[PDB]
Motif scaffolding. Structure first.
Motif, mmCIF file in Angstrom:
data_model
loop_
_atom_site.group_PDB
_atom_site.id
_atom_site.type_symbol
_atom_site.label_atom_id
_atom_site.label_comp_id
_atom_site.label_asym_id
_atom_site.label_seq_id
_atom_site.Cartn_x
_atom_site.Cartn_y
_atom_site.Cartn_z
ATOM 1 N N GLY B 103 0.848 -1.333 0.074
ATOM 2 C CA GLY B 103 0.141 -0.018 0.150
ATOM 3 C C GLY B 103 0.675 1.150 -0.059
ATOM 4 N N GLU B 104 1.852 1.483 1.185
ATOM 5 C CA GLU B 104 2.719 2.928 0.852
ATOM 6 C C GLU B 104 3.336 2.387 -0.487
ATOM 7 N N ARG B 105 3.575 1.836 -0.673
ATOM 8 C CA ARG B 105 4.694 2.256 -2.895
ATOM 9 C C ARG B 105 3.554 2.309 -3.737
ATOM 10 N N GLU B 106 2.209 1.925 -3.680
ATOM 11 C CA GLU B 106 1.079 2.242 -4.223
ATOM 12 C C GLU B 106 0.656 3.319 -4.352
ATOM 13 N N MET B 107 0.381 4.203 -2.816
ATOM 14 C CA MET B 107 0.049 5.584 -2.300
ATOM 15 C C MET B 107 1.487 6.737 -3.080
ATOM 16 N N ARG B 108 2.822 5.941 -2.869
ATOM 17 C CA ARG B 108 4.104 6.943 -2.780
ATOM 18 C C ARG B 108 3.720 7.071 -4.673
ATOM 19 N N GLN B 109 3.674 6.236 -5.135
ATOM 20 C CA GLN B 109 3.034 6.266 -7.052
ATOM 21 C C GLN B 109 2.729 6.977 -7.249
ATOM 22 N N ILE B 110 1.378 7.476 -6.423
ATOM 23 C CA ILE B 110 -0.058 7.859 -6.641
ATOM 24 C C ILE B 110 0.899 9.480 -6.020
ATOM 25 N N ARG B 111 1.430 9.319 -5.463
ATOM 26 C CA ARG B 111 1.362 10.465 -4.949
ATOM 27 C C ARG B 111 2.917 11.555 -5.762
ATOM 28 N N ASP B 112 3.800 10.320 -6.291
ATOM 29 C CA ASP B 112 4.801 10.929 -7.884
ATOM 30 C C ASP B 112 3.897 11.586 -8.793
ATOM 31 N N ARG B 113 3.113 10.180 -9.165
ATOM 32 C CA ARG B 113 1.774 10.894 -10.434
ATOM 33 C C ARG B 113 1.373 12.078 -10.294
ATOM 34 N N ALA B 114 0.730 12.251 -9.213
ATOM 35 C CA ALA B 114 0.169 14.208 -8.548
ATOM 36 C C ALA B 114 1.628 15.218 -8.347
ATOM 37 N N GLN B 115 2.530 14.427 -8.079
ATOM 38 C CA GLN B 115 3.845 15.970 -8.536
ATOM 39 C C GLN B 115 4.452 16.349 -10.004
ATOM 40 N N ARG B 116 4.045 15.267 -10.745
ATOM 41 C CA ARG B 116 4.056 14.820 -11.933
ATOM 42 C C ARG B 116 3.003 16.042 -12.339
ATOM 43 N N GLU B 117 2.087 16.182 -12.239
ATOM 44 C CA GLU B 117 1.401 16.605 -12.922
ATOM 45 C C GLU B 117 1.577 18.348 -12.061
ATOM 46 N N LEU B 118 1.554 18.245 -10.943
ATOM 47 C CA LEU B 118 1.754 19.367 -10.379
ATOM 48 C C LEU B 118 3.348 20.244 -10.370
ATOM 49 N N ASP B 119 4.422 19.541 -11.891
ATOM 50 C CA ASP B 119 5.254 20.250 -12.451
ATOM 51 C C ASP B 119 4.558 20.494 -13.879
ATOM 52 N N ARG B 120 3.742 19.866 -13.991
ATOM 53 C CA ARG B 120 3.372 20.247 -15.462
ATOM 54 C C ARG B 120 2.318 21.114 -15.778
ATOM 55 N N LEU B 121 1.635 21.757 -14.988
ATOM 56 C CA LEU B 121 0.840 22.907 -14.767
ATOM 57 C C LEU B 121 1.907 24.450 -14.263
ATOM 58 N N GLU B 122 2.824 24.077 -13.721
ATOM 59 C CA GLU B 122 3.883 24.800 -12.964
ATOM 60 C C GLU B 122 4.746 25.037 -14.461
ATOM 61 N N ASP B 123 4.435 24.392 -14.730
ATOM 62 C CA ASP B 123 5.661 24.488 -16.341
ATOM 63 C C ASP B 123 4.690 25.362 -17.571
ATOM 64 N N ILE B 124 3.195 25.119 -17.281
ATOM 65 C CA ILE B 124 2.243 25.477 -18.127
ATOM 66 C C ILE B 124 2.086 27.223 -17.968
ATOM 67 N N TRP B 125 2.411 27.204 -16.404
ATOM 68 C CA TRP B 125 2.372 28.607 -15.929
ATOM 69 C C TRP B 125 3.722 29.376 -16.100
ATOM 70 N N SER B 126 3.828 29.112 -16.032
ATOM 71 C CA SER B 126 5.422 29.965 -16.098
ATOM 72 C C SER B 126 5.558 29.950 -17.564
ATOM 73 N N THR B 127 5.663 28.978 -18.830
ATOM 74 C CA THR B 127 5.201 29.563 -19.654
ATOM 75 C C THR B 127 4.715 30.396 -20.238
ATOM 76 N N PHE B 128 3.353 31.036 -19.801
ATOM 77 C CA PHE B 128 2.628 32.085 -20.215
ATOM 78 C C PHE B 128 3.070 33.212 -19.799
ATOM 79 N N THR B 129 3.605 33.191 -18.214
ATOM 80 C CA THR B 129 4.223 33.836 -17.573
ATOM 81 C C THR B 129 5.198 34.510 -18.528
#
Lengths: 49, 146, 48, 147
Positions: B103-129
């Motif tokens: 379970g810990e590995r499942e939720m850590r990989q889920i959180r890592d995917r959330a982190q990748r989504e966060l990075d892509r959102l921040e990249d989009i916003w910065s590129t617009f900025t």
């Protein structure tokens, strides 16, 4: 195996110590991603290529 | 459709590249339909509405945070169910910790995917900025998002 | 070379008139550009 | 391995490559759309039928019609756009069949890219003249038009 077979070659032994690429799978990944740009590397595609 | 002149595009010196302050690789990528180039940006109106777009980006990030916290609560409930099915019945400690580690590995990989989504959102916003004219963007997915 | 350029241009105009996916239109435009470059300086970029 | 930023960066770097060959670049572009099946193609054909019906209704109402309000016009516009998007999706899905069919005529007369573009034109014609009611797989019908 490399160091036990090719041991006298100190020059390329030092080159090996500066390989900065460890792992058979990593080596295949590097070879594929270089000689075949634009395609997504896979575990079996590297070996078959 | 218009076509560039090979004489002024490709050569030992790039005349078009020198004129537009663009390297030959960027010129080739733009000309041969391999990437995108930002022709113009509305600087004044972008700066005028930057407050509102920042508010929208903040509310999107907030919604992302609420949904990720909902996933956190769901994973906490899953951990509670694991505790109920593990610690309430006789079994080996390592056996009851194997499911915990899974379970810990499942939720850590889920959180890592959330982190990748966060990075892509921040990249989009910065590129617009920091968007600028004659700026090359590869990875047409980013262009579609923008 | 002139026939190739004419064919690519006519096909591109037909595609844009009929309505085609943007990737198909971009591929046709790239072909037309390559044909023009081949007509002017053959072999300058890529294989001739 | 497959995780821990092992191959994703390599895949991204590969996707960000020039691929100076035009045919190779076109193949890279065509490789970004997944294939479909019977359910997907019949749903897409239903969307095409709905979009065409809406467009015909709009054309009929344009002259000797009624002043369509926003509520009654936005639905028509949305379904027309959905139909056009579905048509584009089907085209991009079947471009792989197009190139596979067109690979057989190279070496005489024209070039591979010209054959590919003719295949896309034939695929557009087949999509326009397709009929899902016959209960037939799309490839069998589209092969004749591409050829």
């Amino acid at each position: 195996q490399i160091v036990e077979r090719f041991g006298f070659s100190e020059i390329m032994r030092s080159t090996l110590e500066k390989d900065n690429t460890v792992g058979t799978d990593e080596a295949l990944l590097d070879i594929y991603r270089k000689l075949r740009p634009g395609e997504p590397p896979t575990k079996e595609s590297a070996q078959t290529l | 459709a218009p076509v560039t002149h090979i004489w002024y595009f490709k050569g030992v010196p790039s005349r078009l590249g020198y004129l537009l302050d663009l390297a030959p690789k960027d010129l080739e990528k733009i000309i041969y339909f391999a990437a995108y180039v930002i022709t113009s940006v509305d600087e004044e109106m972008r700066h005028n509405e930057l407050s509102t777009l920042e508010a929208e980006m903040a509310v999107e990030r907030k919604a992302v945070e609420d949904q990720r916290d909902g996933e956190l609560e769901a994973r906490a409930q899953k951990l509670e169910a694991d505790l109920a099915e593990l610690e309430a019945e006789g079994a080996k400690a390592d056996a009851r910790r194997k499911v915990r580690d899974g379970g810990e590995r499942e939720m850590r990989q889920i959180r890592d995917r959330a982190q990748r989504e966060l990075d892509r959102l921040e990249d989009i916003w910065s590129t617009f900025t920091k968007l600028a004219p004659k700026q090359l963007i590869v990875d047409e997915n980013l262009y579609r998002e923008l | 070379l002139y026939r190739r350029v004419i064919n690519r241009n006519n096909r591109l105009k037909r595609l844009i008139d009929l309505g085609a996916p943007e990737i198909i239109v971009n591929n046709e435009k790239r072909m037309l550009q390559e044909s023009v470059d081949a007509l002017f300086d053959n072999g300058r970029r890529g294989r001739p | 391995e497959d995780e821990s930023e092992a191959l994703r960066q390599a895949r991204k770097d590969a996707e960000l490559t020039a691929s100076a060959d035009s045919v190779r670049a076109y193949l890279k572009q065509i490789g970004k759309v997944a294939l479909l099946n019977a359910e997907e193609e019949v749903e897409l054909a239903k969307r095409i039928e709905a979009g065409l019906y809406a467009t015909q209704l709009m054309t009929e109402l344009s002259e000797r019609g009624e002043k369509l309000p926003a509520a009654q016009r936005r639905d028509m516009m949305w379904i027309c756009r959905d139909g056009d998007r579905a048509k584009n999706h089907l085209l991009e899905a079947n471009l792989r069949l197009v190139v596979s069919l067109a690979k057989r005529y190279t070496g005489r007369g024209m070039a591979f890219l010209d054959l590919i573009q003719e295949g896309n034109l034939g695929l557009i014609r087949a999509v326009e003249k397709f009929d899902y009611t016959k209960g037939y797989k799309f490839s069998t019908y589209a092969t004749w038009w591409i050829r």
